[PDB]
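Summary for the steering committee. The consortium agreed at its last meeting that each partner would contribute one worked example illustrating the joint modelling workflow. Our contribution is presented below. We chose a case with several input lines so that the handling of multiple components could be demonstrated. No manual editing was applied between input and output; the record is shown as generated.
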Amino acid sequence: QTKHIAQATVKVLQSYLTYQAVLRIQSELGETNPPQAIWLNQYLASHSIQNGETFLTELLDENKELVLRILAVREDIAESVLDFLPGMTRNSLAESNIAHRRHLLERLTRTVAE
Amino acid sequence: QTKHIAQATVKVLQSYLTYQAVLRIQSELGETNPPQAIWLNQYLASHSIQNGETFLTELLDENKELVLRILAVREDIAESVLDFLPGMTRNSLAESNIAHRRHLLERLTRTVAEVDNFPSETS
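What follows is the complete predicted structure of the assembly.
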């Protein structure tokens, strides 16, 4: 179970970083080469980015340059971010738990107080 | 920008982990309380879990105990997995580069044949 969930989570994470990389590049092209910026937007409109790898594999047959730029920027994002995720996520989980627990108590308290 | 991307990535992970927790819980209910297992399943079908936080918040109105069960199991899964993600993601990224590089080489190979046989594609 654990291994399989970890692997599944890594795919989701990588795909999210792929999308994050695509946004950065939408920006960059939104100055440099608007002809390619408009093209990328149209490409996104009809090609899902939910599976980053499938998205990249099909793009590579259509615009290899974009894919390489996406791969490079995704590397920069990954490296700037990966090592913070365990801690930041633990902090967010702890805060989530305290919040739902507080809401849950407010509910029982009202529902017991009358 | 980096901090904002990290913050957003955290929300995505947290929600994914709450989805995973909901599934583990619904399977455990499968033998423990089959009526509650079909109920959770149907609740999942009609309520989006793409934001795990609002999912849990709405669930509170229907079942307080279940929310806590989901939170606790979500912690189990997170602790079992979080520390592996940096390393495994780097491996997965290296593996993606190998696959795309291979694919680029396959395109290059086809272009060399087009050049060698110009304007024909092969032979």
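The radius of gyration of chain B is 23 Å. The domain at 1-123 of chain B is CATH 1.10.1200.210 (Non-ribosomal Peptide Synthetase Peptidyl Carrier Protein; Chain A).
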